Symmetry: C3
Subunit: 203 residues, 3 copies
Amino acid sequence: IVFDIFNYIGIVAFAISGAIKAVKKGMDLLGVLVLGFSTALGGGIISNLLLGKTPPTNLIYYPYPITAFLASLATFVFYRIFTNVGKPLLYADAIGLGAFASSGASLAYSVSNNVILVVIVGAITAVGGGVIRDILSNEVPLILTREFYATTAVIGSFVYFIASDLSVPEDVALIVSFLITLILRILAMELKWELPRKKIEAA
Amino acid sequence: IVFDIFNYIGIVAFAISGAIKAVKKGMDLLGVLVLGFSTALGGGIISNLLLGKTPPTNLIYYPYPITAFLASLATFVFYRIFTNVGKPLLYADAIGLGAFASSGASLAYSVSNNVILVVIVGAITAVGGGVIRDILSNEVPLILTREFYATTAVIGSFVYFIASDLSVPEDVALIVSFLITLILRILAMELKWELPRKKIEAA
Amino acid sequence: IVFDIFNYIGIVAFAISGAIKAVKKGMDLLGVLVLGFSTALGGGIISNLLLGKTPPTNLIYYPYPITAFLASLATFVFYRIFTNVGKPLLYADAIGLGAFASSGASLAYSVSNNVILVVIVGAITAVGGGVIRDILSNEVPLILTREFYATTAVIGSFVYFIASDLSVPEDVALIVSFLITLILRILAMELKWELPRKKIEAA
C-alpha cells in the first residue's frame, strides 16, 4: 500500500546528495537544483524513454519533482547542517537505491518478460541519476570507478525478475527485491567492498 | 504567420555560437559542424524524445538541419569575421532563446496541460542544445555555473503556460512568452545578473 | 542471409576496444563492462529512441548484449594478449563500422524516406557508442577531434540511402553500403586522413 515512504525517502536522500555535490562543485543555485533533480529523478526519466513511456512520470506526477526541488532547495539554504549528517544520508541513500531498483525493474518487467531488459533498466532507474550528475560535473561517473552501488542494484533487479518469474505476487516481489538491495548495499558500505581492477605497471 | 523568422535567427545564431566554441576547443571540421548542429537543434531533439514525438522534427524537416549545417560551415570558413561580432550575436542568441522556449513550451502543452512538464520541457528546448555542446566539450555546462540563460527560459516557459491556462489564444501566447524571455535576457546581459552561490571557506 | 557474421564481428571488436579504453582509464570491472557494452551497443540504443522503436533491440535480443558482455569480460581477464593485437582490431573495428552504419541506415529508412534522418541516424548507430564511451571517460569524443570514423559512416549511410532510392534491393543495398564504408575506413587508416582544423595563433 504505502511503499511511497521508501520512494519519498529516496527522492529526498538522492536530491540532498546531488545538491551537496553541486555546492562542492561551485554551481550556482540553478545548478544545485538541477544536480539534485537529476540525481533523484533522472534514472526514472531514462527508463521511461528506454521503455517508450511518454511523458516521463518524474516530469508529470507533481509530488515527485516538487519533493526533489524542495529537498535540493533546502540543502542549499541550510548547507551547514546538511553536510555533517554523513552516516544517516548514506543509509537513506541505500533506501532510495532499493526502492528505485525495485520500481524500475517492475516497470521494465511489465513491458517485457526479459531478464536482460529488467536487470539493466532496473539498475538504470537506481544509479542512472547519479551518472547524469557526474557527467554534468565533468567527472568520470562514480559507478565506473569505485564502491558497490550499481552492482547491488543489478543484483536487486535480478532478484525481482526471478521472484516474478516464479509467480511471486508483485508487492511481495517489490519488498524482497528492495530488502536484498538494502542488505548488499550495507554490507558493501561497512566492509568497503569493491570490484577488481587491472593493475598495469606503466613504462 | 511568420514566426519562422525568429526561429531561423535562433538556429543561425545558436549554430554560429556553437561552431565558435568548437573552433576555440580545437575540434576538426566535423566537430565544429556537430557542435553547431547540437547547440541549435539538440534542445528540440531532447524534447521530442521526452514528449514521445518520433522521429524528431530537427532531423526530419529539411530547412532546420540545412540551416544549422550551413551556418556552422560558414562560421568555420569565415571564422575571422564571425568571431568579432560580439554584441550582435549576443542579441541574436537572446532571440533564439525566446523563440525556442516559446516553441517547446507550446509543444509540451499540447501533450499535457501540466505546469511542471511545460516549464521544464520549454527550458530544455532553449538551453538543452548548449548543455550537449558543453558536455561534448568536456566541460561543466554553463547554465549550472554562471549567467542567467536557463532561468530566463524557465520564466518564459511559465509565462506561456499561464497565458494558455487563462485561455489566451496560441499565437498571442507565443509572442508574449517570446517577448518576456527576451526582456529578461537583455536585463541579465547588461546588468550582469547571476544566481547566488554558496561561498565555503576551505580548510 | 548471414550478415550476422559482420554484426557479430562488430559487437566483439567494439566491445574489446571499449573495454581496453576502460582498463587504461582505471575503471573497475563494472566500468570495463559498461564501457564495452556502450561502445558496441549504445549507438543502436540511441537510434531506437530517435526512431521511436521501443524497447531497444540491444537490450531485448539476448545474443547481442550477451556477446558484448562476454567480449568485454574476456578483454578484462586476458588483457595481456588482447592489448597487443593492434592492426587486427583496427580492421575488425572497420568491419563493425560498416555493418553498423548499414544496419542503422536501413532502420532509419524504413521509418522515413528522408536523406537527413537516414544519414545522421545511420552514423549515430556506427559511432554513437564510442561517443558515449568517451563522455563516460570524461574526454572530448574522438570523432570531434581527429581521425576519419564518423565521416566514413556518414558517406556509407548516404550510399545506402541513394541505393534504396534508386530501387536497389535491400540486401544488395546493405552490402554495397557496408563495402564502401569499409573501403573509406581503410584508406583513412593507412593514409592518415583527417579533416581540416582552424589554426589560430594565440595572443
